[PDB]
A paper describes a structure:
During protein synthesis, ribosomes select correct aminoacyl-tRNAs (aa-tRNAs) by monitoring the nucleotide (nt) pairing between the anticodon of the tRNA and the codon on the mRNA in the aminoacyl (A) site. Decoding is thought to be governed by a conformational transition in the ribosome—open (off) to closed (on)—that occurs upon codon–anticodon pairing in the A site. Ribosomal ambiguity (ram) mutations increase miscoding and map to disparate regions, consistent with a role for ribosome dynamics in decoding, yet precisely how these mutations act has been unclear. Here, we solved crystal structures of 70S ribosomes harboring 16S ram mutations G299A and G347U in the absence A-site tRNA (A-tRNA) and in the presence of a near-cognate anticodon stem-loop (ASL).
Numbering used by the authors:
A (entry chain RD): 2 to 273
B (entry chain R7): 1 to 47
The structure:
Amino acid sequence: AVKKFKPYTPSRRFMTVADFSEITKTEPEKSLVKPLKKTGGRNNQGRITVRFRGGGHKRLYRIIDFKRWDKVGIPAKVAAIEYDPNRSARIALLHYVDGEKRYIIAPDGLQVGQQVVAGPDAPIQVGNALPLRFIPVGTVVHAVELEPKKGAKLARAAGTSAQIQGREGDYVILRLPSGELRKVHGECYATVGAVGNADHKNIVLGKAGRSRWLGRRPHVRGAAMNPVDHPHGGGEGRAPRGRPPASPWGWQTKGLKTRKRRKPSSRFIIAR
Amino acid sequence: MKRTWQPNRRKRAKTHGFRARMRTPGGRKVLKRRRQKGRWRLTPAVR
RNA sequence: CGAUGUCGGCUCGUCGCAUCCUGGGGCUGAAGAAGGUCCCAAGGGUUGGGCUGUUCGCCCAUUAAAGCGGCACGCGAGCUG
RNA sequence: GAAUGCCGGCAUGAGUAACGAUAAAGAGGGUGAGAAUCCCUCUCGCCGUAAGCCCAAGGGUUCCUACGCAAUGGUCGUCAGCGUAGGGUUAGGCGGGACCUAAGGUGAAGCCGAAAGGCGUAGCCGAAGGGCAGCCGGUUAAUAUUCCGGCCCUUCCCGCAGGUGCGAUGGGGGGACGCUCUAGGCUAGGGGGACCGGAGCCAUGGACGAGCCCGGCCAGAAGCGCAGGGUGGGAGGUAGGCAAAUCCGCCUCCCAACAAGCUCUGCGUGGUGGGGAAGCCCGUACGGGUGACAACCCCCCGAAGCCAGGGAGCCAAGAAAAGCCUCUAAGCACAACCUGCGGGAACCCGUACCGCAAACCGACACAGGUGGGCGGGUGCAAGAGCACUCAGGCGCGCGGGAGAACCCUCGCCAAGGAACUCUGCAAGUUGGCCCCGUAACUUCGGGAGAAGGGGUGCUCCCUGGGGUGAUGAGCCCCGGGGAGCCGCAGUGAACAGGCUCUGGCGACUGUUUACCAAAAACACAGCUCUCUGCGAACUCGUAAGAGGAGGUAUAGGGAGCGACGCUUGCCCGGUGCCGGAAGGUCAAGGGGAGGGGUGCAAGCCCCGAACCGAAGCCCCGGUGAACGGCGGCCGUAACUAUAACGGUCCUAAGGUAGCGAAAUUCCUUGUCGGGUAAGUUCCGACCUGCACGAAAAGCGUAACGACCGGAGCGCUGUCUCGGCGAGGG
RNA sequence: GAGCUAGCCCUGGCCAGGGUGAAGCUGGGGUGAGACCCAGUGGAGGCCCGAACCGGUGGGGGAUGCAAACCCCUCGGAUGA
RNA sequence: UGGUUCGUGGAGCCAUGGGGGAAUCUGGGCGGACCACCGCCUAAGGCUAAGUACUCCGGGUGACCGAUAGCGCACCAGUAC
RNA sequence: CGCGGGGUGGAGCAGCCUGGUAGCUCGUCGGGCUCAUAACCCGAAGGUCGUCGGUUCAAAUCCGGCCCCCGCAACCA
RNA sequence: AGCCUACGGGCAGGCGCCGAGGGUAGGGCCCGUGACUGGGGCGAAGUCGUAACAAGGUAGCUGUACCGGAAGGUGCGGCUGGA
RNA sequence: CGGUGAAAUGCGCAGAUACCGGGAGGAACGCCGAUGGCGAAGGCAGCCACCUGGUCCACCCGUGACGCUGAGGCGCGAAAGCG
Ligand SMILES: [Mg+2]
Ligand SMILES: [Mg+2]
Ligand SMILES: [Mg+2]
Ligand SMILES: [Mg+2]
Ligand SMILES: [Mg+2]
Ligand SMILES: [Mg+2]
Ligand SMILES: [Mg+2]
Ligand SMILES: [Mg+2]
Ligand SMILES: [Mg+2]
Ligand SMILES: [Mg+2]
Ligand SMILES: [Mg+2]
Ligand SMILES: [Mg+2]
Ligand SMILES: [Mg+2]
Ligand SMILES: [Mg+2]
Ligand SMILES: [Mg+2]
Ligand SMILES: [Mg+2]
Ligand SMILES: [Mg+2]
Ligand SMILES: [Mg+2]
Ligand SMILES: [Mg+2]
Ligand SMILES: [Mg+2]
Ligand SMILES: [Mg+2]
Ligand SMILES: [Mg+2]
Ligand SMILES: [Mg+2]
Ligand SMILES: [Mg+2]
Ligand SMILES: [Mg+2]
Ligand SMILES: [Mg+2]
Ligand SMILES: [Mg+2]
Ligand SMILES: [Mg+2]
Ligand SMILES: [Mg+2]
Ligand SMILES: [Mg+2]
Ligand SMILES: [Mg+2]
Ligand SMILES: [Mg+2]
Ligand SMILES: [Mg+2]
Ligand SMILES: [Mg+2]
Ligand SMILES: [Mg+2]
Ligand SMILES: [Mg+2]
Ligand SMILES: [Mg+2]
Ligand SMILES: [Mg+2]
Ligand SMILES: [Mg+2]
Ligand SMILES: [Mg+2]
Ligand SMILES: [Mg+2]
Ligand SMILES: [Mg+2]
Ligand SMILES: [Mg+2]
Ligand SMILES: [Mg+2]
Ligand SMILES: [Mg+2]
Ligand SMILES: [Mg+2]
Ligand SMILES: [Mg+2]
Ligand SMILES: [Mg+2]
Ligand SMILES: [Mg+2]
Ligand SMILES: [Mg+2]
Ligand SMILES: [Mg+2]
Ligand SMILES: [Mg+2]
Ligand SMILES: [Mg+2]
Ligand SMILES: [Mg+2]
Ligand SMILES: [Mg+2]
Ligand SMILES: [Mg+2]
Ligand SMILES: [Mg+2]
Ligand SMILES: [Mg+2]
Ligand SMILES: [Mg+2]
Ligand SMILES: [Mg+2]
Ligand SMILES: [Mg+2]
Ligand SMILES: [Mg+2]
Ligand SMILES: [Mg+2]
Ligand SMILES: [Mg+2]
Ligand SMILES: [Mg+2]
Ligand SMILES: [Mg+2]
Ligand SMILES: [Mg+2]
Ligand SMILES: [Mg+2]
Ligand SMILES: [Mg+2]
Ligand SMILES: [Mg+2]
Ligand SMILES: [Mg+2]
Ligand SMILES: [Mg+2]
Ligand SMILES: [Mg+2]
Ligand SMILES: [Mg+2]
Ligand SMILES: [Mg+2]
Ligand SMILES: [Mg+2]
Ligand SMILES: [Mg+2]
Ligand SMILES: [Mg+2]
Ligand SMILES: [Mg+2]
Ligand SMILES: [Mg+2]
Ligand SMILES: [Mg+2]
Ligand SMILES: [Mg+2]
Ligand SMILES: [Mg+2]
Ligand SMILES: [Mg+2]
Ligand SMILES: [Mg+2]
Ligand SMILES: [Mg+2]
Ligand SMILES: [Mg+2]
Ligand SMILES: [Mg+2]
Ligand SMILES: [Mg+2]
Ligand SMILES: [Mg+2]
Ligand SMILES: [Mg+2]
Ligand SMILES: [Mg+2]
Ligand SMILES: [Mg+2]
Ligand SMILES: [Mg+2]
Ligand SMILES: [Mg+2]
Ligand SMILES: [Mg+2]
Ligand SMILES: [Mg+2]
Ligand SMILES: [Mg+2]
Ligand SMILES: [Mg+2]
Ligand SMILES: [Mg+2]
Ligand SMILES: [Mg+2]
Ligand SMILES: [Mg+2]
Ligand SMILES: [Mg+2]
Ligand SMILES: [Mg+2]
Ligand SMILES: [Mg+2]
Ligand SMILES: [Mg+2]
Ligand SMILES: [Mg+2]
Ligand SMILES: [Mg+2]
Ligand SMILES: [Mg+2]
Ligand SMILES: [Mg+2]
Ligand SMILES: [Mg+2]
Ligand SMILES: [Mg+2]
Ligand SMILES: [Mg+2]
Ligand SMILES: [Mg+2]
Ligand SMILES: [Mg+2]
Ligand SMILES: [Mg+2]
Ligand SMILES: [Mg+2]
Ligand SMILES: [Mg+2]
Ligand SMILES: [Mg+2]
Ligand SMILES: [Mg+2]
Ligand SMILES: [Mg+2]
Ligand SMILES: [Mg+2]
Ligand SMILES: [Mg+2]
Ligand SMILES: [Mg+2]
Ligand SMILES: [Mg+2]
Ligand SMILES: [Mg+2]
Ligand SMILES: [Mg+2]
Ligand SMILES: [Mg+2]
Ligand SMILES: [Mg+2]
Ligand SMILES: [Mg+2]
Ligand SMILES: [Mg+2]
Ligand SMILES: [Mg+2]
Ligand SMILES: [Mg+2]
Ligand SMILES: [Mg+2]
Ligand SMILES: [Mg+2]
Ligand SMILES: [Mg+2]
Ligand SMILES: [Mg+2]
Ligand SMILES: [Mg+2]
Ligand SMILES: [Mg+2]
Ligand SMILES: [Mg+2]
Ligand SMILES: [Mg+2]
Ligand SMILES: [Mg+2]
Ligand SMILES: [Mg+2]
Ligand SMILES: [Mg+2]
Ligand SMILES: [Mg+2]
Ligand SMILES: [Mg+2]
Ligand SMILES: [Mg+2]
Ligand SMILES: [Mg+2]
Ligand SMILES: [Mg+2]
Ligand SMILES: [Mg+2]
Ligand SMILES: [Mg+2]
Ligand SMILES: [Mg+2]
Ligand SMILES: [Mg+2]
Ligand SMILES: [Mg+2]
Ligand SMILES: [Mg+2]
Ligand SMILES: [Mg+2]
Ligand SMILES: [Mg+2]
Ligand SMILES: [Mg+2]
Ligand SMILES: [Mg+2]
Ligand SMILES: [Mg+2]
Ligand SMILES: [Mg+2]
Ligand SMILES: [Mg+2]
Ligand SMILES: [Mg+2]
Ligand SMILES: [Mg+2]
Ligand SMILES: [Mg+2]
Ligand SMILES: [Mg+2]
Ligand SMILES: [Mg+2]
Ligand SMILES: [Mg+2]
Ligand SMILES: [Mg+2]
Ligand SMILES: [Mg+2]
Ligand SMILES: [Mg+2]
Ligand SMILES: [Mg+2]
Ligand SMILES: [Mg+2]
Ligand SMILES: [Mg+2]
Ligand SMILES: [Mg+2]
Ligand SMILES: [Mg+2]
Ligand SMILES: [Mg+2]
Ligand SMILES: [Mg+2]
Ligand SMILES: [Mg+2]
Ligand SMILES: [Mg+2]
Ligand SMILES: [Mg+2]
Ligand SMILES: [Mg+2]
Ligand SMILES: [Mg+2]
Ligand SMILES: [Mg+2]
Ligand SMILES: [Mg+2]
Ligand SMILES: [Mg+2]
Ligand SMILES: [Mg+2]
Ligand SMILES: [Mg+2]
Ligand SMILES: [Mg+2]
Ligand SMILES: [Mg+2]
Ligand SMILES: [Mg+2]
Ligand SMILES: [Mg+2]
Ligand SMILES: [Mg+2]
Ligand SMILES: [Mg+2]
Ligand SMILES: [Mg+2]
Ligand SMILES: [Mg+2]
Ligand SMILES: [Mg+2]
Ligand SMILES: [Mg+2]
Ligand SMILES: [Mg+2]
Ligand SMILES: [Mg+2]
Ligand SMILES: [Mg+2]
Ligand SMILES: [Mg+2]
Ligand SMILES: [Mg+2]
Ligand SMILES: [Mg+2]
Ligand SMILES: [Mg+2]
Ligand SMILES: [Mg+2]
Ligand SMILES: [Mg+2]
Ligand SMILES: [Mg+2]
Ligand SMILES: [Mg+2]
Ligand SMILES: [Mg+2]
Ligand SMILES: [Mg+2]
Ligand SMILES: [Mg+2]
Ligand SMILES: [Mg+2]
Ligand SMILES: [Mg+2]
Ligand SMILES: [Mg+2]
Ligand SMILES: [Mg+2]
Ligand SMILES: [Mg+2]
Ligand SMILES: [Mg+2]
Ligand SMILES: [Mg+2]
Ligand SMILES: [Mg+2]
Ligand SMILES: [Mg+2]
């Protein structure tokens, strides 16, 4: 349940902050993990590439175990649920009985002291990683690989979930959070359970401040630019965009599909 | 009000310096053009 | 067109008369008072506000009257804008 | 002889404008060929969270002294930041380097590019960040944490003395961190004192008095003392920390739970060293002496600074590396490393001076700009605000008279109060604190400082709380009640809201046309559409590579709308986009019916129709919070008027809700109603909407606005309608 | 050529003094348990007044200027985009 | 595709980026599509003086200048600024 | 004052470009159905094609002139 | 600073609180009134349609929601005052 | 092929309708079923488990008048509607 404010100043009657009750008494982070400073940058080697980024609070990166085949059959116990500012979801600190400490994406219902195992064994309960080959049909799964032994690259944001629908030979088909039925390999590891912190959907920023704090700089409409800047720009008061709506670079923005149709990955995709 | 020339030995040396001219092939001709006409100073005198 | 600043207001005026008043006068369908119209007459005077950027105009309260025009639609090396 | 010609010279305006903040000068005396302008003294004025001190950048001899005044100085000049010459900058501890890393730059391996060159892991470079050992005084005309004096430290290298498995750029810990609010004890700084030490002074009516005036400090090893920060100690087992570890990490019983103990700071006191006024006397620009054998004590206020890696709360979740401690690997365990002592060795660069400005950036000795620290006292509730004033520094490098117009900047005014005017533009009224008291509306926060009021000084009396002192006096912080005094007036000077009612737009804080526009424009939280399943879409680049992102549909891009409430209607005919293994057309290519050129012929060379031939287009469907569009003419009801009703025509469908003479209305100052004595503006209505209308959104909406309009109260030189006075010209 | 200007990255600094008083904590109340209501504490916020600081709203001055954007009064923000 | 006078032209020759792809004297290219005849050369490796171009440099000469001319500089000029 | 569309039976539209034909729907008139009306069924009439000319053998039709009606335009100072 | 007939007294007079009332400012309730506007009742033979009463020719009524010149229609659920 | 009183719109030679096989998803639970049952009403239906309330019978065991109603308040409250 996201916690709300009273209108003692404007832009707090709408502002909403996430419930931080599941974050246990581990508010500062864990060294020997998180060894990296995050490189702040909006631009590649010079020019800006993705527009309207900059500012925002300073962040240290938490390194996350997406390769859960490192520790097959080696259990761990959850000792912390922590805040990762690099992500929409929360992270969980695993103490392996092996002795090594690792961060993981924190699923829904995962509580502290619960132990979690990875591998072909490690029964079907939240937090455990298995290959998609062994997980029963109809179960809910996150942290899914698309190709085996390349890293978890699916169903990682808050509240997201992928559902196993069936098998075709050595491939398993998944309903992805978009609704796309994608046919991904059987040996791809994937962590059972939904992601959780699904209330990230409901948080209202209240003001421009919380966007600037997250590094979202003000987005400028093409209607208010000039014909040298944007296709929509120019004219006297509030031109109605005078053409099929386009990007600053000319490509149309409403309906024009932009994936390569000749992709080799198109014969693994079934739905929207 | 604040004007254009806000001096800095660091900036002047690292921008208009001999070791900066010698990196780029464009700045190498700046030295060629100045030696061939007889400039007493190929570089802004930075101290 | 190698530059003649444009409306309106303000300040300062000055001139024409085909005269709004005051002065003189003929006719009147002028009894008297108040009028009408025409002639002589410019010496002087020709209000304060509401609306509008406005000139003009419509109003309000008066007045002897609340005149029309010219002067680069007088006047920005005088003002405003 | 002309080209607003080029170059140089000299004229006119003209002894005219000006001489650079209205902080302000007067006299006496020196020097001097020459003094308003240089030096000295007395008097006056100005700054004083600076116009005063200390740094950094930048400037580069401007610093000090001697001799000088051609030019520089907006005048003069004996003066100078000016000319000639000489002198002056002293570091193991300050800053930087023989240390480290951040962004970024660079770059062996590697990738890429016609060439030049573009990337790029490790590494290297890269600093107000991390690390690291000096405090107090005195000397020079000019340097000092640099020289000197006292006290105190840091690295090495070489020796002896005592310990231990020693030992890496490798493993681990630590370094190491946000914002806001803050608790305890200190310190910096400050106020008072009958106490202590001092030259001196009793003036002009009074005072020989706990009188006046001035001063009552600084640093300081170990040891203590007081605050405070960091840390648990054993045993096993151990697959992880890319070899190995006894170290770290993970389990499992035992022992404390705590600063008890180990360190580590800070602050006092500490052997001892040093400083030390006012006033008086002199040979200088400047300092010297005595005052002193100086005293060097006690209270109170007290930080934003210290203990510091303190605590609490919150979300927007808060550098890296080296030094440092520990662990082992080669090797080595005669080596080596640790602790204590002794001796010796400690290099390079900066160091003057200006430094909110006459020395920097503005062509100028330019009213502009320039980052960090100290920035005293008194009063006003507080405060870096305001007024005066310590220390300190200035009177701004043209002056002297006059007392016109006119101008700037001021001050005041009879009666009237906006009649001024585009507009109360400007100017004025209000103005601090305490206490009453406060409407519609409201999103229940607000609106609110609504509005509108009252008290404000001084003296005397009684009396309630705290803080530091022991519960007490004292010093300080807040209060309550009573009785009186004076003036026109008590925030007695300076700093310090005019208020209300009602509309438009925009929700709001915010951004914008450096240098005529700050807005109703932009942005904004939030809504919707659409693309993108990850070597994502999109963006830069030929490429490599990179952003997106060390992200993964609750994510990322693009587009529009722009809090919030109630809503967003019909048209897919044309355009865009989306979906259609049919069909038509369709280029290269395949294919060869058939024909041509040469050969004596094998042959060689040309064309060349059926037919097979993609995307695209045509065709078929869909789609509006995609581009867009959303009718005309007639007649009809109990008087007149109008038309709920009907007829016909066309369209892809013919504007629904909600608004409406509006930021939209031409005719138009439309017509009614309200405000006025009078209202082309304003407000409320009607609807004949030239030419509103639903995300280029529609209608509303509390709060908000240096936005735009209308009105009213208070007040006023805006005006009737001017007058007087002041200072700079 | 980014020593002016715009944006972003790395690393430091600055924001006197007052007001208002959100969440949360303690106690009392309420209930069958709650919701919730009271005080006391607490000190939130692109909150309020207002210096430094950052701007540049209205007017006046300036116009071969002190100044190729200045000066005076007035004014906005001033813990945050 | 480029070069050549050749801009697709009857478009050869000479180089080529792309696809297919031989032969060794009875072998191969060329003589401006092409075919026959008649002739000329012998590709898919390389080197090679001299004659030719220029004038930082020294000399000779000038119906060249003579300090606003002649080089931007006759002068300590690529200086001051 | 300009540019281009239109005036056709009582109403609303066709027919014009390509001349010899004026058609559609409603309405009017007469008769059916009903008890009567509306609805419906059957059968009829009705147009100087805005006026003035000239073109042709012949004009709603083609060409000019006026009178009406509709739409756009009327800018830069 | 006055006047008194028996004076550490009396009167006149002065000051102070309260004070009817007048003024200023903001609220509460009520009454009249206003261009225009909503709906109501009645009125004469007006216009449009036929919703309900007979299975009223679509059984009716209802709460709600949306739409339509208007009765009204339709969606969801309910009722017997219907079969 | 759909559909109807009859038709039309519509769907389909791009391969519809009818048939088979597999897959996805959502809603409601046929037969039992009733003139039934349960609940204070609204209302409640495939099956399983857990947590849970009301209620009936016998035995006449204990308390022993603790009882009835109920303005307020409080909770529940079909369908439609709202975030
Ligand atoms: Mg680290
Ligand atoms: Mg880079
Ligand atoms: Mg670069
Ligand atoms: Mg935008
Ligand atoms: Mg624009
Ligand atoms: Mg551009
Ligand atoms: Mg364009
Ligand atoms: Mg363009
Ligand atoms: Mg002209
Ligand atoms: Mg001329
Ligand atoms: Mg006359
Ligand atoms: Mg007369
Ligand atoms: Mg007369
Ligand atoms: Mg008479
Ligand atoms: Mg007469
Ligand atoms: Mg006016
Ligand atoms: Mg005129
Ligand atoms: Mg005149
Ligand atoms: Mg004229
Ligand atoms: Mg004129
Ligand atoms: Mg002028
Ligand atoms: Mg004028
Ligand atoms: Mg104007
Ligand atoms: Mg103006
Ligand atoms: Mg001539
Ligand atoms: Mg000449
Ligand atoms: Mg000229
Ligand atoms: Mg000249
Ligand atoms: Mg002269
Ligand atoms: Mg003179
Ligand atoms: Mg003159
Ligand atoms: Mg003069
Ligand atoms: Mg003068
Ligand atoms: Mg001066
Ligand atoms: Mg003398
Ligand atoms: Mg420095
Ligand atoms: Mg320096
Ligand atoms: Mg200089
Ligand atoms: Mg010099
Ligand atoms: Mg000097
Ligand atoms: Mg001298
Ligand atoms: Mg001189
Ligand atoms: Mg000389
Ligand atoms: Mg001079
Ligand atoms: Mg000067
Ligand atoms: Mg002399
Ligand atoms: Mg000198
Ligand atoms: Mg060395
Ligand atoms: Mg060395
Ligand atoms: Mg180094
Ligand atoms: Mg290193
Ligand atoms: Mg190369
Ligand atoms: Mg490089
Ligand atoms: Mg380095
Ligand atoms: Mg370095
Ligand atoms: Mg450093
Ligand atoms: Mg440092
Ligand atoms: Mg140091
Ligand atoms: Mg000095
Ligand atoms: Mg010293
Ligand atoms: Mg060891
Ligand atoms: Mg070591
Ligand atoms: Mg480490
Ligand atoms: Mg390390
Ligand atoms: Mg001290
Ligand atoms: Mg002290
Ligand atoms: Mg004494
Ligand atoms: Mg005396
Ligand atoms: Mg003292
Ligand atoms: Mg001490
Ligand atoms: Mg232990
Ligand atoms: Mg190991
Ligand atoms: Mg403790
Ligand atoms: Mg000590
Ligand atoms: Mg002394
Ligand atoms: Mg002295
Ligand atoms: Mg802390
Ligand atoms: Mg390193
Ligand atoms: Mg240590
Ligand atoms: Mg020095
Ligand atoms: Mg110095
Ligand atoms: Mg300073
Ligand atoms: Mg200067
Ligand atoms: Mg200078
Ligand atoms: Mg200048
Ligand atoms: Mg000066
Ligand atoms: Mg200033
Ligand atoms: Mg400054
Ligand atoms: Mg201070
Ligand atoms: Mg002070
Ligand atoms: Mg006082
Ligand atoms: Mg104050
Ligand atoms: Mg301070
Ligand atoms: Mg003063
Ligand atoms: Mg002084
Ligand atoms: Mg001066
Ligand atoms: Mg006076
Ligand atoms: Mg007056
Ligand atoms: Mg008066
Ligand atoms: Mg008045
Ligand atoms: Mg007026
Ligand atoms: Mg007037
Ligand atoms: Mg106004
Ligand atoms: Mg004003
Ligand atoms: Mg006042
Ligand atoms: Mg009110
Ligand atoms: Mg209001
Ligand atoms: Mg309030
Ligand atoms: Mg008040
Ligand atoms: Mg108000
Ligand atoms: Mg007094
Ligand atoms: Mg105490
Ligand atoms: Mg104290
Ligand atoms: Mg008083
Ligand atoms: Mg004031
Ligand atoms: Mg308003
Ligand atoms: Mg308006
Ligand atoms: Mg501007
Ligand atoms: Mg400009
Ligand atoms: Mg503004
Ligand atoms: Mg919205
Ligand atoms: Mg790039
Ligand atoms: Mg590209
Ligand atoms: Mg990439
Ligand atoms: Mg990245
Ligand atoms: Mg987006
Ligand atoms: Mg999106
Ligand atoms: Mg918009
Ligand atoms: Mg907008
Ligand atoms: Mg509302
Ligand atoms: Mg719409
Ligand atoms: Mg359409
Ligand atoms: Mg379409
Ligand atoms: Mg279509
Ligand atoms: Mg279509
Ligand atoms: Mg298509
Ligand atoms: Mg072909
Ligand atoms: Mg062929
Ligand atoms: Mg095709
Ligand atoms: Mg009628
Ligand atoms: Mg009709
Ligand atoms: Mg409609
Ligand atoms: Mg309009
Ligand atoms: Mg008025
Ligand atoms: Mg009126
Ligand atoms: Mg009116
Ligand atoms: Mg109105
Ligand atoms: Mg209207
Ligand atoms: Mg609009
Ligand atoms: Mg729209
Ligand atoms: Mg809008
Ligand atoms: Mg509106
Ligand atoms: Mg709105
Ligand atoms: Mg509003
Ligand atoms: Mg505003
Ligand atoms: Mg604002
Ligand atoms: Mg207003
Ligand atoms: Mg005046
Ligand atoms: Mg005067
Ligand atoms: Mg004067
Ligand atoms: Mg810059
Ligand atoms: Mg910059
Ligand atoms: Mg505060
Ligand atoms: Mg509270
Ligand atoms: Mg606060
Ligand atoms: Mg604020
Ligand atoms: Mg504000
Ligand atoms: Mg303020
Ligand atoms: Mg400061
Ligand atoms: Mg600034
Ligand atoms: Mg201004
Ligand atoms: Mg402006
Ligand atoms: Mg101005
Ligand atoms: Mg304000
Ligand atoms: Mg403020
Ligand atoms: Mg060619
Ligand atoms: Mg060719
Ligand atoms: Mg050609
Ligand atoms: Mg050719
Ligand atoms: Mg080839
Ligand atoms: Mg060949
Ligand atoms: Mg050939
Ligand atoms: Mg040949
Ligand atoms: Mg030939
Ligand atoms: Mg040949
Ligand atoms: Mg050869
Ligand atoms: Mg060769
Ligand atoms: Mg040659
Ligand atoms: Mg020569
Ligand atoms: Mg020359
Ligand atoms: Mg000569
Ligand atoms: Mg027609
Ligand atoms: Mg027609
Ligand atoms: Mg009939
Ligand atoms: Mg009938
Ligand atoms: Mg023009
Ligand atoms: Mg134009
Ligand atoms: Mg007595
Ligand atoms: Mg009395
Ligand atoms: Mg009273
Ligand atoms: Mg009263
Ligand atoms: Mg009273
Ligand atoms: Mg009275
Ligand atoms: Mg009253
Ligand atoms: Mg009341
Ligand atoms: Mg009323
Ligand atoms: Mg019915
Ligand atoms: Mg019926
Ligand atoms: Mg019925
Ligand atoms: Mg219903
Ligand atoms: Mg319907
Ligand atoms: Mg029903
Ligand atoms: Mg019935
Ligand atoms: Mg029945
Ligand atoms: Mg099937
Ligand atoms: Mg579905
Ligand atoms: Mg039960
Ligand atoms: Mg019994
Ligand atoms: Mg429901
Ligand atoms: Mg719903
Ligand atoms: Mg709705």
